[PDB]
Amino acid sequence: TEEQIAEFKEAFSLFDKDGDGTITTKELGTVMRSLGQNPTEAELQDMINEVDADGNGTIDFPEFLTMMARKMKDTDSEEEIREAFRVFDKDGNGYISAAELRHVMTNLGEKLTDEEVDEMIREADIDGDGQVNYEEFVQMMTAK
Amino acid sequence: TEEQIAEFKEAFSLFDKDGDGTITTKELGTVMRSLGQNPTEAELQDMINEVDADGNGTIDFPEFLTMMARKMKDTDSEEEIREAFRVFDKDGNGYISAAELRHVMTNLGEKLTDEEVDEMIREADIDGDGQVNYEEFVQMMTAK
Amino acid sequence: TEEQIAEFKEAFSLFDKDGDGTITTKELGTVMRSLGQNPTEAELQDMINEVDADGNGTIDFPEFLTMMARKMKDTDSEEEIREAFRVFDKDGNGYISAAELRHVMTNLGEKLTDEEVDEMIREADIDGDGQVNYEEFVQMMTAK
Amino acid sequence: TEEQIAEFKEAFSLFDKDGDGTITTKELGTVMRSLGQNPTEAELQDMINEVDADGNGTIDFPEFLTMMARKMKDTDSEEEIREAFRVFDKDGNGYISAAELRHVMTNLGEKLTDEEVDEMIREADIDGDGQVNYEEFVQMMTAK
Amino acid sequence: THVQGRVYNFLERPTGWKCFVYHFAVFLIVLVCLIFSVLSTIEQYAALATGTLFWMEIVLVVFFGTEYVVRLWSAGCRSKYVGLWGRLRFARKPISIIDLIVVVASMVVLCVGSKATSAIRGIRFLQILRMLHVDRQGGTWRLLGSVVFIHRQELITTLYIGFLGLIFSSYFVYLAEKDAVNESGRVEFGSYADALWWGVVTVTTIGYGDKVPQTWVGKTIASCFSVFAISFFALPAGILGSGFALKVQQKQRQKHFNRQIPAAASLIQTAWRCYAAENPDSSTWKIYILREHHRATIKVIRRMQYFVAKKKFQQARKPYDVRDVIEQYSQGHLNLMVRIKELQRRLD
Amino acid sequence: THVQGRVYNFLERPTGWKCFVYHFAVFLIVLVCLIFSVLSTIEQYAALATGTLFWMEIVLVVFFGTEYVVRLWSAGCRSKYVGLWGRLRFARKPISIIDLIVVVASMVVLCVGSKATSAIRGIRFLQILRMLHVDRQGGTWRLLGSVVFIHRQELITTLYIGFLGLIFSSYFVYLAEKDAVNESGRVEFGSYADALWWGVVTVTTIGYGDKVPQTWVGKTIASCFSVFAISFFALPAGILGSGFALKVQQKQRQKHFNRQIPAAASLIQTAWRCYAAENPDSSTWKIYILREHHRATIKVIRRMQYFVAKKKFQQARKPYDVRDVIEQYSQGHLNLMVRIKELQRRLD
Amino acid sequence: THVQGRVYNFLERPTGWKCFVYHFAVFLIVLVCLIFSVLSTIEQYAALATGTLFWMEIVLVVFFGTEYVVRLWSAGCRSKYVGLWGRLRFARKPISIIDLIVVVASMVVLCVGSKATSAIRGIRFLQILRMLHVDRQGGTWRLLGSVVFIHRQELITTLYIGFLGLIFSSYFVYLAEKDAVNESGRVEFGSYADALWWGVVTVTTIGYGDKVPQTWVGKTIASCFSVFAISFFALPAGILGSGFALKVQQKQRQKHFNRQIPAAASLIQTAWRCYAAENPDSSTWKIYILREHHRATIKVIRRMQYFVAKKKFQQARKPYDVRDVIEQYSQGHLNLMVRIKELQRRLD
Amino acid sequence: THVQGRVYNFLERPTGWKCFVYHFAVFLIVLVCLIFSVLSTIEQYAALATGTLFWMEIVLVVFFGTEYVVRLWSAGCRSKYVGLWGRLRFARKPISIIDLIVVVASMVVLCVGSKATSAIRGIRFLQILRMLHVDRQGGTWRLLGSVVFIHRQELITTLYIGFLGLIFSSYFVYLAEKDAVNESGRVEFGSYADALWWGVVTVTTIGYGDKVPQTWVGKTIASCFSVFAISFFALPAGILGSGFALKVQQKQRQKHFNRQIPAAASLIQTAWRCYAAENPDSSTWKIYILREHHRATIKVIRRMQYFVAKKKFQQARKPYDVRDVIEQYSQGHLNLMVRIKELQRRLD
Ligand SMILES: COc1ccc(-c2csc(NC(=O)[C@H]3CCCCN3S(=O)(=O)c3ccc(C)cc3)n2)cc1
Numbered sequence A, B, C, D: 001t002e003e004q005i006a007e008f009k010e011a012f013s014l015f016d017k018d019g020d021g022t023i024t025t026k027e028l029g030t031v032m033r034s035l036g037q038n039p040t041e042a043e044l045q046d047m048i049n050e051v052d053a054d055g056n057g058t059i060d061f062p063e064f065l066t067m068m069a070r071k072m073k074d075t076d077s078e079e080e081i082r083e084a085f086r087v088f089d090k091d092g093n094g095y096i097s098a099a100e101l102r103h104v105m106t107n108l109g110e111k112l113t114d115e116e117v118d119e120m121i122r123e124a125d126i127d128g129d130g131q132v133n134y135e136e137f138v139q140m141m142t143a144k
Numbered sequence E, F, G, H: 001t002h003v004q005g006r007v008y009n010f011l012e013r014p015t016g017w018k019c020f021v022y023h024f025a026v027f028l029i030v031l032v033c034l035i036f037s038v039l040s041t042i043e044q045y046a047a048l049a050t051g052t053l054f055w056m057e058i059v060l061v062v063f064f065g066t067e068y069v070v071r072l073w074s075a076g077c078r079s080k081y082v083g084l085w086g087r088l089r090f091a092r093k094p095i096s097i098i099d100l101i102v103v104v105a106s107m108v109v110l111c112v113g114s115k116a117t118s119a120i121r122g123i124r125f126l127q128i129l130r131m132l133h134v135d136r137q138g139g140t141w142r143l144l145g146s147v148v149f150i151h152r153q154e155l156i157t158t159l160y161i162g163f164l165g166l167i168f169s170s171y172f173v174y175l176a177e178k179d180a181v182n183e184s185g186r187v188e189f190g191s192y193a194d195a196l197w198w199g200v201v202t203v204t205t206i207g208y209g210d211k212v213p214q215t216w217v218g219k220t221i222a223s224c225f226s227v228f229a230i231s232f233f234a235l236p237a238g239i240l241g242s243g244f245a246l247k248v249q250q251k252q253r254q255k256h257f258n259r260q261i262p263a264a265a266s267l268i269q270t271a272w273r274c275y276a277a278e279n280p281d282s283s284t285w286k287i288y289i290l291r292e293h294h295r296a297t298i299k300v301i302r303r304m305q306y307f308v309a310k311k312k313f314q315q316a317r318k319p320y321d322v323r324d325v326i327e328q329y330s331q332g333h334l335n336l337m338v339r340i341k342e343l344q345r346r347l348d
């Protein structure tokens, strides 16, 4: 875990860019605009509130490490993703069409690049009348 | 129904005025201002939200066709109009005065041209002490 | 009542100042600013909503006459005023001090001219240890 | 108590600065900005509402004296402070760490000067594995 | 015709102090005749009441039949019920059916049973049956049915679970008690039917005491059953009471919704506009001031005006909620942001 | 005069620990005298209590009469009740009537029945009747009556439906059971009255067991009735309890409404201003600084100021609601839009 | 395969009028067979029903076993249950266990008890047990268990306090009544067990009357107990009813939450983006348009995008509340203040 | 010292699965010993249980006394209870008193009644009394007392009205029934006490049936009483249940209030600042950067900072409400208006 905190402190140094040891909303927005994204202030606020437990408005390095620590391949996260698919499931049998999925990835919420979805579909066995088992995806992307 | 979709696609081409295949709020407001109406932005927004089922903010041609498809001469629409008359019915017996109706058409809500109401009254048998049976109107304008 | 409506139509002509037959919020605010008062828009709105029964936002002459018609010397208005005094009554016995009353008239809510309150006190028998029976006032100013 | 009201009237003369006998929000904000503090308007409003009982928006000298009169070493104030500590008490045994306390004084709410907290800690017997009995502080600062 | 609606309101849309006294007096005379039906069953008074109930019946059949025809005529004020087929539609409704049945059967039993056992056996049931005459528009039963339909799942749940508890627990009590003998020598629980009787009487908290268990197994089971099952036959009270109250209160607060008036007007207006669109010779075209394709787009815009007005009206009648506050706040807030940005650009 | 209101507060507007102990002790002595009224009916103790209840009655009539006149004098603090006709208005109110009746009838029965059967037969009822003395301002009964009036439709509904269920079901049970004979040889259901007795005792869940059905039809009907009708005589508990709670809580939270003070003041001020308008010689004219028609317009504006203040005050006393939030948001939002447009034009 | 899911929906996800009639008819035949189980216990009809119940049992075992295997096949539509181990997972669930037990035990008792006392003694319990077959997805029991778990503290409180009241009060009644003798000569309260029986029957408002106290101490205690303890065995009705209602209503209003769709999509998208990040050869890198340390920061930002989307989604499914209104108001208000300050500076 | 608090949490602040099993097992052994106390009263088993209950009592007195002293030592973790006088304060609290009484009285009865009637007569009550040992921190009783105090007016209302109804109605039933004779020859209602017994048993819906009225007046009164009074002894269930539920739910939702942390910190900080003000040599003076009168004004401002922080904190712990929304909206709205006016002037 020493290499882990070495890499995490390296990562925190990118945002810090100071001996501050904290990150402010702008201090994140600058790094994001460096990539050509253009977030909103409300976006960065809601972003930042999901890391701190101090209620200050800034991320101390322990909180940054804490966010790193907790795992995506989780009991609860898996079920949340699974429940999210079910909104788009007609008949609730555990299957969804292909073209419907492509329609939903590329239009609703954060729209995706077409090549991204082209990759996404072919991760799963899409044949079989075009249906796909979405728990296959869930097991895939909760494998880490 | 092929002639029906021909006319509907013709109609959609008026709003599109592009190979876009969609209509934006301005892309509707321009066509309205071409007629000398001057709507509000909030008006066009609330207008447009009653056609789409995508949640995008634009009308795809299937949604346009869907709006065309569903019928005015309906079980529910009829009852809604009937209930709307009842707000202006003293004594609830199914009759309203003539001059009261003229007063309400020409003053409240979207005011009407006087000639419009002059036509509206004479559609129904207005004689008989000036009372009129409003379900007669409802059967008339739900006949299509 | 013919002289009554003559005077009321005379009075309505002051606000109308047009062949409109209605009064708008500004059409009232102008007449008020003519007197050197300077109301707020919200004031005039809340003012005007207590006269109309059309929901239009303007006062038709029948509504103006209706406001004239209903009487101040009323069963309910009397009790409302009486209940209003009771907020300022220590011990609830039906008496309030003099100086307390002067303090409340000249400071809270619409502050009054000192000469007004000087007149107000002497309307009632203020002697008797400075106490005053406020239902005496209520009977006075509900006598019309 | 004559010397007490002499000093209190002396103190009220600092804020008054005119033969008004009252203090307005600005009339307080000026005195505060004289010290280099820069409060907010909302701050001064909420400040001032905790002194008056007139509902006017200003502090009469009786209300100022009343605020002076009521005592900090109180039955209720003591318990409120005690309950406030308990938010920062793991395990609820009546003890809190030293460094945790320093962290909370210098970061959350009104941040303090480091020398202030350096004084604050040494008021209490901080030895004994670093724990401190916070009711000792409560008895101290409710001794007046 | 004014008189016609006036008497309709007197009989069928009552309000005031005169109408109330009338319907009251009707209730009282029918109740008195019911009490004579009661006392007809007692041997001491079976003669007095039996004769009295033959003359009051004649009085009443005359009265109620008269009232019936008066009402059936007076229903011409309503436009549903104008015309012959209208009055037929009036006679079709349930309360009128019941009134008619009572009147005719009274008349028949009198004219036939003049010269008489089944006669009075039927009279008593008619006296009972006449109590439906009181509630005229059935607001009582409508309230009940509404609240039951809303809360149907809860009630089915209770009924199912309580039923099961009864069945099982009563079987086990039967097994434990089937051979036990009472102090008086008799066997209370000979059969499973008797145990079910016990269970019904128990779980619903009546406790006649005609059947009690003697054994220790029976008492144990009965105690546990009695503690843990009785609730499921007492929930419906809470459910139905809360439902009644809520329904009445919201149906009352609906009176103060004044926003619905312009919504109604707008709905009417845009509907008729959509209709009159279909006549190109109409006068609704002058509002726009040649027209190759303007026809279609106007019709489309009007149709969707109609739809939005319809939804606005349908929501104009319901009470506000936090969700609406949030929606309007976000909407106005973003409008304000774009406007201040607009000015921010107009300066530059 | 300070003392007068002080004792009024002691007797009639109680609060604290002294007043409470007083009213408590009063309650206790009246309860004890009631228990002696109880034990007077028992043959063993009919002598002891009968004598005791002749001396305690004298004590009490003296005490309560004294308290009555003290109170009737002390009511001069209130301005309703100042003056002779004021005290008469005080004696007019119900609780004072009851107190007076008790005192006088006690005195009469003592002075007459000294030298006595109907005497003690009346004494017992007076002892019972004295319990009304406790609640002084009737907040108990007022709460009840309020909650009943609010929830009147629900309760009438329950009463009607339960009544009907009782009547019908009991008729059918009568028909099924009229000839059945009990183990002891007697007929439980000889008449429809007996079946109604059964039904009342059953549907309300008492179950004495004095009348039970034997047949299978009777048991079937009784089971279904018992399951499906009992709720309608148990709803009122839920209704009335929720009503009590809500009423008390809102009447308590009304204490923290501090906005009503300026509203009250404004109402008073504009009312008196409207009045003093009617004296042209008044000093309320100097606020405006000749006057051909200014008189009328000033009077009009003041009248409508009065009306708006009246409504504002009437709503200043009630709790806020989502509708008010929505109204104020829309109002302020549109004000802000017109203001920013105004600045947008002032630049151009 | 369409047919497979179609029949699954028919049997296991019912809706409509055909499915309802089917499940209804099933309920009715099982109820009828239960009534024959009832009447088998009566001596008059113990022969008729006993024979009838041997043929209907054969009919039913065939029917239910057939239905069982049809269902077990049709469950391949679900992806949980595809494959052999899937069908095993289907047989594993409780209702399927119960169905299987009923079918097999019916078959066994028939094939063995053909040539029979314990036979029918078991048949009756199977007839009772078959009623669990009705509710297919257990929404009944799930609702109950949910509402109990939510309100567990309240119910434990009631049970504890009522239990204690029972114990103490019954001990004191025992002490007061242990030597008392009844009119019929017997002693009702010989033991503390009998007093506990009395207490249970009393506090829960059944009142068989098999045990009543005679003394004055007993009656005093019983009165006070009866007034002040009975409530604690009647609270659960109110609690559970309110819980049922609330749960159903909110689970219904959850249908109209339409904001959850984009939240779900965003969650999915950012999750898969986080995953595909771990393949540097992925195509999610082209969105940013070399990369010494850009890798890490992109991964970090995406991880926290995922977390915020997760919370937003988890709150997108719950109803709004005043707290959210306040938060958004403050947020937007401060945004607006900083924006107007920004313009205020841009001019200068 | 870590161990000390660890065992304190085990005994007195329980949580988990080990602690639960422990307290469970304790409950079970005490319940078993209670059942032997029960069976000691029965003649068959009065020997077995009587001997068993002499050895288990020794076991238990050892166990509970040990646990008591362990706990009394372990309470030094709390700072209330550190020191000798601390442990005395621990022994002072009620549950510890009860535990001690049980232990000592057990020991005494054993050491004395070794060589014994009053012995076991006391043993049984101790076995009963030991059930208070279970709830350690009294959350049960605290919840109850809270909900009663909140709803005190409602409950007094019910008790008063129901009491009165009982008294009056029972007097009239007495008058109507005092001379009536039963089938068995006896008089049910000889005295008013008997009628009160009847009334209590009736109005609360128990219905033993030991006393039933025969006359028509009695039955009439009883019917009306039974319909219209029973509710007032069933309201408390609804009241108390709703209270329990609300209290628990809000005490749970209070966990998610995260705004209270900075409020607490600010309160602490400004309080200590006010205190340290009183030392002119303090270091809180350096924040302001000679001082003739600056002392006083600083002290004043700090005192009122303290007061505002105090109120903010006291309201930081309570749930939001519409009133707060309205206040903040108005406040921010007027701030925004004055700011836009400010800019409107800065341009000009
Ligand atoms: C005084 O404090 C109390 C009192 C009661 C409760 C409480 C909650 S849930 C509940 N019962 C019940 O949940 C159901 C189900 C579990 C057993 C008890 N009853 S069953 O007899 O109908 C019953 C019995 C047997 C069968 C086959 C079906 C149904 N009882 C809680 C606290």
Ligand SMILES: COc1ccc(-c2csc(NC(=O)[C@H]3CCCCN3S(=O)(=O)c3ccc(C)cc3)n2)cc1
Binding pocket: F144, F148, F155, F156, F158, F159, F162, F232, F233, F236, H161, H162, H164, H165, H168, H225, H227, H228, H229, H230, H231, H232
């Ligand atoms: C089935 O439908 C129903 C059933 C009941 C009601 C209902 C509302 S209020 C109410 N009783 C009551 O309000 C009280 C007071 C009025 C008489 C009836 N009870 S009293 O006997 O306790 C009673 C009797 C005598 C005395 C001196 C004091 C108290 N009863 C409403 C609807």
Ligand SMILES: [K+]
Binding pocket: E204, E205, E206, F204, F205, F206, G204, G205, G206, H204, H205, H206
């Ligand atoms: K009962």
Ligand SMILES: [K+]
Binding pocket: E205, E206, E207, F205, F206, F207, G205, G206, G207, H205, H206, H207
């Ligand atoms: K009962």
Ligand SMILES: [K+]
Binding pocket: E206, E207, E208, E209, F206, F207, F208, F209, G206, G207, G208, G209, H206, H207, H208, H209
């Ligand atoms: K009973």
Ligand SMILES: [K+]
Binding pocket: E207, E208, E209, F207, F208, F209, G207, G208, G209, H207, H208, H209
């Ligand atoms: K009984």
